[PDB]
Amino acid sequence: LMPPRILVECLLPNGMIVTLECLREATLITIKHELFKEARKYPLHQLLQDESSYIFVSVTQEAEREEFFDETRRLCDLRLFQPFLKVIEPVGNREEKILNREIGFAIGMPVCEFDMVKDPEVQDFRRNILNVCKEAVDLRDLNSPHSRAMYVYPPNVESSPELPKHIYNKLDKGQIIVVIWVIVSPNNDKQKYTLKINHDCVPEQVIAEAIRKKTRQGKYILKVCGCDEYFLEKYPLSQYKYIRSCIMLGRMPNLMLMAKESLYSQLPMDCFTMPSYSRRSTKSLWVINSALRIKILCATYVNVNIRDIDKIYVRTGIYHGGEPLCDNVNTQRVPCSNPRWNEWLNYDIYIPDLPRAARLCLSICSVKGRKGAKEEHCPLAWGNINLFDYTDTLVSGKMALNLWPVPHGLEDLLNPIGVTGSNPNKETPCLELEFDWFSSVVKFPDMSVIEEHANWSVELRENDKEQLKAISTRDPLSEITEQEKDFLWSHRHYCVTIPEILPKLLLSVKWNSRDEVAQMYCLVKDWPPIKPEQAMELLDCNYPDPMVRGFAVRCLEKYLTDDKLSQYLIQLVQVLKYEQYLDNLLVRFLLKKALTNQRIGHFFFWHLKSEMHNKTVSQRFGLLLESYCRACGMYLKHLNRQVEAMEKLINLTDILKQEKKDETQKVQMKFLVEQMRRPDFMDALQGFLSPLNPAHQLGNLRLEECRIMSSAKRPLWLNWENPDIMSELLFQNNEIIFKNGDDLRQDMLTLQIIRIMENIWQNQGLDLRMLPYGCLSIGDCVGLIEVVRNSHTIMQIQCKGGGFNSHTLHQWLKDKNKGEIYDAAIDLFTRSCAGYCVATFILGIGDRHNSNIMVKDDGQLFHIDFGHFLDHKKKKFERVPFVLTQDFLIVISKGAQECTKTREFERFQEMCYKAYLAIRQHANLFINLFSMMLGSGMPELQSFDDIAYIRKTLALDKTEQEALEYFMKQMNDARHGG
Amino acid sequence: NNNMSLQDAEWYWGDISREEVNEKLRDTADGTFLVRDASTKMHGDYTLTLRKGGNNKLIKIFHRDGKYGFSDPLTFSSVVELINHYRNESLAQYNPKLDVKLLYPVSKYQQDQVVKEDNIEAVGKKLHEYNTQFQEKSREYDRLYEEYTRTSQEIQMKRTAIEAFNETIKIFEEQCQTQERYSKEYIEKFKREGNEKEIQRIMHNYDKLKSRISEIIDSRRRLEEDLKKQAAEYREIDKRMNSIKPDLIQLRKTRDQYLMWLTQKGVRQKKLNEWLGNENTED
């Protein structure tokens, strides 16, 4: 950040001052050599010692002092606050400081801040996460070096060994044809060997067959051609995702033989060292017999207008999830001019009946328009308190909390969704409080006392079994009445034989009754395990109980495969916010599974780091990132390279957009090409693992291909190359859209859901085609968009060729595909349209014009910017239907003028029917995913009533036939003959 | 009286979603209730929502052989009779925990009479004017919020910068203290020796150091003053936001009230869509 000539001040240890002149690219060792070569001339050089006994120290733009043990790093990358350098004797450790600097750069904030904060919960989290880190390290170092090879290169295996019959019939006699390349030669001479082998063959059988046809204790392994994907663990060759995708698409698989010793040597040795901080009257809650009382003293800062608002008040409550344990209590003593209340508020809930996950949600609200019957209360700031701390002790004595601003659009006064804790910023409304002192430490009783209390307080064959099953099969967000709750709690002992009903029984229990809660604790302790996609329900905000979440985590540990974990990682990260502590079973499980799989680690890091800017969970995510980067092995360097490249890209985009928005396209292109040609940018951008896929490697940028598109947001069309030797087999180059300015997290969620709908449809037995392409969020309003090749918008199609006849798309497809290819192209186009119509109808994606919908060359179509993943751009819960236009109808009808009069039309409608019924059958999982995505902070969902629009579109209120008729009438109204 | 039209009953609302039920019963006292048609749309369900303990409790009215009731056996003739009886008497007999009456019934007639200028052209013109006011207030609020976010970012970065200046000053002052500690003895020894070249060189270095420290102090002070000014602007923008939110809420509420009044007149919903804003407005 210092382009021109620099006059660096030198802060000698004897007290000298000298200003050397050096270029921006000089290194620290060169600077020290010149500095001690210039201090001899000036006085006080007798006390000066040799260079090797001294190191540097300065201050960076992040307001920290770094003692520079790494000398090879150049001056520009140091990021000094001011051009000055101080020479002091070394006091820290070489490796410790270098590692801490790398961790800080990867995270985005210095590692010294977490030592600066003195919160005992934070310190205990940092001390105790190292046990998990060490267990993961030991597990990686169990089978040397095959275990480390498995860690760095995860087998990309699907959870289902067997194949759906619609693609199992695509095999010839159940045999897969695979090309084997052997490149072992004096020169890089490529020879291929085509093998036709059964699907259930393991890699050792594949390698034996390859050797036998090569015409000759296995010293070789098999790698995907064109990517960093390896086949290591002995699993059926059809189970791997690349090979199954090749079977699905009819594409010819390609493999290649790498020596085991070559890869084993190529793997760096990973070392994990414990950091510095590794070395560095109570009575039970139930003995208390009193109500819960809390005092509110004053609001230090309040940004209220005197004229507009007269009175302001703070509203409180006791919550367990989103459900108030007791009725809310309000304060009203003083106007806005002098905020001070000093009122002992009393809650009609006994202390011994306080649940272990009890909280205290506050909000300073401003009552306006007191004149007239209607009183309007608008909140000024909100805060939450976790009445029980991480050591199982009730909060006692004086307390103070800064209060966060109310989120955009959150009208209701209390905000129990938000995270417990004070605002780190200190120029915010601070509301000092009080908690009654009980002359001792108020501790929650242990499980022995819980067990002693529990079980001591105590169609229709023998029970109403049909109603139990009906409630079980009912989705989580459906209305559950008081009669149903009483029935469920009364028949709790029989609910074990239906383990799919634990969520509903949990909602049935009365959380403000210790007898009921103890009985439910015993029931959950003896509960049988359930499906992981149902156990992920019990981690949402609606189930804050430690034992509920521990049972859900145990179920995840038992039954969560790694492909499913990578599918649900977005949500399993997002439900880290809903945790009330730092150290807990969910984060232990996720970190243990992120330090034994480098794809999980890559997306774990990038999802956690996507949310540094949000101060709400920034501290927890920063500490988690610190531990991950501490024990992530050698991948830290690749992560640092990715962070460098995206920092350069973000700076480029900012400078392009805000300083020179009025600058014309050509001049902006000139500036872009100049700054790309700039050597430090060039070096930072070349040669790093892509963030969208750790296997894909980005190579030499193509400055001629790179450009900025005509879209209003000015995104970057960045074209890389493939450094793999056999790049031609998969793809010669990588082009990626760098998007800066738009939130891509809604698109990320929509594409996750689309991928899951394909999984459901294919497992059922349909063949609908989707492209859930890659999207990543790398921070705030910044992200990566993977380009699909050979694609064109219908707007592009219409424009090309000269070119309003809706026959243009059909003519373009006919010109692209000829012969027998035409039938397959039209079939693929129709199946893609069916998937698109069903998916956009169900999720309520907004208006699609011509410019966000692309047709590939082989006839496949897909949808680009989702933007709003639900109809809340207009309203929640007539609503937005899917659209199917005249050109689509013409091509599906193979160019017939009477589109609705052909057989392919009703074939398409039947495919839509089956797809919709499959999604309506599996809507429970979609509801759980959308409800676990509540804490994202996206503008859309934010409570539950915006998730409810999926219930509306899927018609979970009606029955199956009624919903099918509803979809039929929706489709007919949609086209309305065109 | 005891058994009149369920449609004429004021607690009856018709086909409203549970979301609208929760919106209507948000932050209301105990005993509040309304009766709406069931979401399942199966005839005879008639879910009743009573708010006890701060929660929108749900109780379902079983319908059998021309009778109504909460649970078997059914002993009541009609929904109106059930509602009136449990308004008169509490629910403790039905459920021992549910010790509450049905005190405050939500009525659709109050909103019927609150709206003024009932004629069609008047409600249309008022709807248009209030929609324009609502759009103006919404764009003002969005601009205010983006300005607030920008100012918060500026405050955070300037606080980091001022902390960095404090650290720089600490380093410089420690170095100058070390310089004086060494230079006292050094200057004393060279004064004993009797030469002035190194003395003047050391003095030149010391005044150069002092000038640099003074410059950094001046820059830090200027940054701190700018930080105070930006903090004042941030507080002013927060005050304007807190002032402008209630007016936007009231405009939205009255616009929706006018929309519902217009729709409850038999006029075309296509005309409603065309007239309102035919735009991305929520309602």
UniProtKB/Swiss-Prot annotation, chain A:
Q: What range(s) does the PI3K-RBD domain occupy? A: 173-259
Keyword Nucleotide-binding on this protein?
A: yes
The effect annotated for Y301C is: Found in a cancer sample; uncertain significance
Catalytic reaction equation(s): a 1,2-diacyl-sn-glycero-3-phospho-(1D-myo-inositol-4,5-bisphosphate) + ATP = a 1,2-diacyl-sn-glycero-3-phospho-(1D-myo-inositol-3,4,5-trisphosphate) + ADP + H(+); a 1,2-diacyl-sn-glycero-3-phospho-(1D-myo-inositol) + ATP = a 1,2-diacyl-sn-glycero-3-phospho-(1D-myo-inositol-3-phosphate) + ADP + H(+); L-seryl-[protein] + ATP = O-phospho-L-seryl-[protein] + ADP + H(+); 1,2-dioctanoyl-sn-glycero-3-phospho-(1D-myo-inositol-4,5-bisphosphate) + ATP = 1,2-dioctanoyl-sn-glycero-3-phospho-(1D-myo-inositol-3,4,5-trisphosphate) + ADP + H(+)
The record's region (G-loop) falls at 708-714
Taxonomic superkingdom: Eukaryota
PIK helical domain location, by residue? 459-631
Q: One GO biological process from the UniProt record?
A: regulation of multicellular organism growth
Region ranges (Catalytic loop): 844-852
Which residue range or ranges hold the PI3K-ABD domain? 2-91
Related illness: PIK3CA mutations are involved in various type of cancer. Mutated isoforms participate in cellular transformation and tumorigenesis induced by oncogenic receptor tyrosine kinases (RTKs) and HRAS/KRAS. Interaction with HRAS/KRAS is required for Ras-driven tumor formation. Mutations increasing the lipid kinase activity are required for oncogenic signaling. The protein kinase activity may not be required for tumorigenesis. Colorectal cancer: A complex disease characterized by malignant lesions arising from the inner wall of the large intestine (the colon) and the rectum. Genetic alterations are often associated with progression from premalignant lesion (adenoma) to invasive adenocarcinoma. Risk factors for cancer of the colon and rectum include colon polyps, long-standing ulcerative colitis, and genetic family history.
The record's note on quaternary structure and interaction partners says:
Heterodimer of a catalytic subunit PIK3CA and a p85 regulatory subunit (PIK3R1, PIK3R2 or PIK3R3). Interacts with IRS1 in nuclear extracts. Interacts with RUFY3. Interacts with RASD2. Interacts with APPL1. Interacts with HRAS and KRAS. Interaction with HRAS/KRAS is required for PI3K pathway signaling and cell proliferation stimulated by EGF and FGF2. Interacts with FAM83B; activates the PI3K/AKT signaling cascade.
- Family per record: Belongs to the PI3/PI4-kinase family.
- Full protein name: Phosphatidylinositol 4,5-bisphosphate 3-kinase catalytic subunit alpha isoform
Q: Provide the species name.
A: Homo sapiens
Q: What is the lineage of its organism?
A: Eukaryota, Metazoa, Chordata, Craniata, Vertebrata
UniProtKB/Swiss-Prot annotation, chain B:
Question: Which intervals hold domain SH2?
Answer: 11-106
According to UniProt, the tissues expressing it are described as: Isoform 2 is expressed in skeletal muscle and brain, and at lower levels in kidney and cardiac muscle. Isoform 2 and isoform 4 are present in skeletal muscle (at protein level).
Q: Effect of altering R87Q?
A: In a patient with severe insulin resistance; lower insulin-stimulated lipid kinase activity compared with wild-type
For this chain, the Swiss-Prot or TrEMBL PTM comment says: Polyubiquitinated in T-cells by CBLB; which does not promote proteasomal degradation but impairs association with CD28 and CD3Z upon T-cell activation.
> Where do the coiled-coil regions begin and end?
none
In this chain, where does the modification Phosphotyrosine occur?
Y145, Y258
Q: According to the UniProt entry, which disease involves this protein? A: Agammaglobulinemia 7, autosomal recessive: A primary immunodeficiency characterized by profoundly low or absent serum antibodies and low or absent circulating B-cells due to an early block of B-cell development. Affected individuals develop severe infections in the first years of life.
User: What domain notes does the record hold?
Assistant: The SH3 domain mediates the binding to CBLB, and to HIV-1 Nef.
What's the subunit arrangement here? Answer: Heterodimer of a regulatory subunit PIK3R1 and a p110 catalytic subunit (PIK3CA, PIK3CB or PIK3CD). Interacts (via SH2 domains) with CCDC88A/GIV (tyrosine-phosphorylated form); the interaction enables recruitment of PIK3R1 to the EGFR receptor, enhancing PI3K activity and cell migration. Interacts (via SH2 domain) with CSF1R (tyrosine phosphorylated). Interacts with PIK3R2; the interaction is dissociated in an insulin-dependent manner. (Microbial infection) Interacts with HIV-1 Nef to activate the Nef associated p21-activated kinase (PAK). This interaction depends on the C-terminus of both proteins and leads to increased production of HIV.
What family, per the record? Belongs to the PI3K p85 subunit family.
Tell me, what does this protein do in biology?
Binds to activated (phosphorylated) protein-Tyr kinases, through its SH2 domain, and acts as an adapter, mediating the association of the p110 catalytic unit to the plasma membrane. Necessary for the insulin-stimulated increase in glucose uptake and glycogen synthesis in insulin-sensitive tissues. Plays an important role in signaling in response to FGFR1, FGFR2, FGFR3, FGFR4, KITLG/SCF, KIT, PDGFRA and PDGFRB. Likewise, plays a role in ITGB2 signaling.
Q: What is this protein called?
A: Phosphatidylinositol 3-kinase regulatory subunit alpha
Protein source organism: Homo sapiens
